[PDB]
From a paper:
Then the mature Mpro forms a functional homodimer and transcleaves pp1a and pp1ab. Given its essential role in the viral life cycle and the absence of closely related homologs in the human genome, Mpro is considered an attractive target for anti-[name] drug development (12–14).
Further, we solved the structures of [name]-[name]-2 Mpro mutant ([name]) in complex with six cleavage substrates from replicase polyproteins.
Residue numbers in the entry:
A (entry chain C), B (entry chain C): 301 to 308
C (entry chain A), D (entry chain A): 1 to 300
Write the structure that this text describes.
Amino acid sequence: TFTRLQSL
Amino acid sequence: TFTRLQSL
Amino acid sequence: SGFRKMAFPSGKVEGCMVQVTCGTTTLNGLWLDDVVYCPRAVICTSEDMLNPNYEDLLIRKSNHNFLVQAGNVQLRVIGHSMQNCVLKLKVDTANPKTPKYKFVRIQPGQTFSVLACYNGSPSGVYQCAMRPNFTIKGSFLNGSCGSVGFNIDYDCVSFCYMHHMELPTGVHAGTDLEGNFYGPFVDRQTAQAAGTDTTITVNVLAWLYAAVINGDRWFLNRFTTTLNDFNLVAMKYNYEPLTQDHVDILGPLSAQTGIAVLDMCASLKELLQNGMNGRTILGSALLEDEFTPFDVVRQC
Amino acid sequence: SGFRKMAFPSGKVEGCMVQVTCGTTTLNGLWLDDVVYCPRAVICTSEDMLNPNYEDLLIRKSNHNFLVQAGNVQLRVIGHSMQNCVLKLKVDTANPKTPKYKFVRIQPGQTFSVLACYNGSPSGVYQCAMRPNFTIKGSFLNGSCGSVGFNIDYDCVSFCYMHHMELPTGVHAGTDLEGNFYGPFVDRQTAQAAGTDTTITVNVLAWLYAAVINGDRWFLNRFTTTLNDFNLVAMKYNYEPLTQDHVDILGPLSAQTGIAVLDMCASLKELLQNGMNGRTILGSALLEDEFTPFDVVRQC
């Protein structure tokens, strides 16, 4: 499980 | 218990 | 990810809120184009409120008895009339911030955002459902009369609620924007009571789908039930019957999760019969019924 | 009467939200005066995100690599710089909707309103607490990067949070508006985890006072406890210790209800040891810890 930088 | 018309 | 009680952004509505004063009574109004909408209770005083005759009270008023304040600017009232339980005050200035809008009446089980206001000044925003008994469980203090409830559909504000009063149980009653009350309530300070309420079943199912979409799966089981054996269990726990329309509404959510509606109904039945036994779903220890299927899809 | 998870009206913040694009990456920015603030992660691409060197990536950019859209109008970028984990894009047009504002960093246990945005477009508003472990339990989808959290103090928006990322547990991490992360997190897609959380005790007590103010009294008892015998029970249930500062904070609420803080602590102790046994407080079957004493006073 990795972090998610929630750009698009 | 009576209703309250919540004007000011 | 995550699931919150989310309201619509309130900017479009904040630009419509004004203060209306008549005599020593003040409350909030909604300024759209050249009309200000507010509860007709603004024309009552302390003693008038038990058994007011509003047609009598309004005939004794003229335009200059209504003080409308839009922030700093006082607005000039040039006409007045009554429609059911709301007053329409025509003003000499169209609101330059008027959004595209509609007046819509909502159904029990539907949700909306409330912009709580005092003296024309927006104070907070929160999300509400219309209960099956046509009350809402709001948060409202003296002075909140005339605050409005709404949805936003794209650029268009659909106004659905204007706040009028608090019932003895501390729940709230109001009208649509043509002044027609939700439920069997009247704008006079008498001994009115909400009828018995029920839990909104389609909404509880929607929220269970939101939980699965968010990784909460412990309440799932292999069982399925029939629509009728479910509806038989629903009645005992004061839940509304589920219709095939509701199954259809839940279609997209069952497709996204791969859990048939009647499959999820079997989980709801077990939760109702055994409780949660110390566990939580989406942060709650209760089955939540104030999210519609639409709310879930939009947020998830 | 009534008690809701209430957010601040979002209009003042909606007028500051813009879209920022660099390459094929798009996210939200905050436009105040002639500066646009956004997460520096906008200058990364898919492969850069595991181990980006942001100083390197930014040196390889010029002003014309940043597309800023304020609704219809494209804004001209005339300068760029990095401050910690945020980018400052100087634009040739001051935002005419800029409110009075401050950049403030909040403490764990404090609350704020989140305006969730996608492609510069406000989508919903909700209320959050900063958890003791410096995460927030938000509701955020891809594209929400750069949404901001804030409080309003009178006419002044105190910005306290900019959203950056989602952790594996589905909780959220971000920075203050000078780009400094809350908690031990970094803006790269690695295997970071939130530390263990605790329950915010002063907030649970505040909410119990809100319940009493609203007529929920069943959990009250005749007993009182000492601050130390309470704090001994708090540790076993993963609650923060209560300080005399906190007792002082709760002063006004204890005065309004006539229930001494240590009196209310004795009720909390019993709830922790025996549960609620099928009952609810202010509509919840759990002890709620995301309302501060200030939130309770303001709403009640």
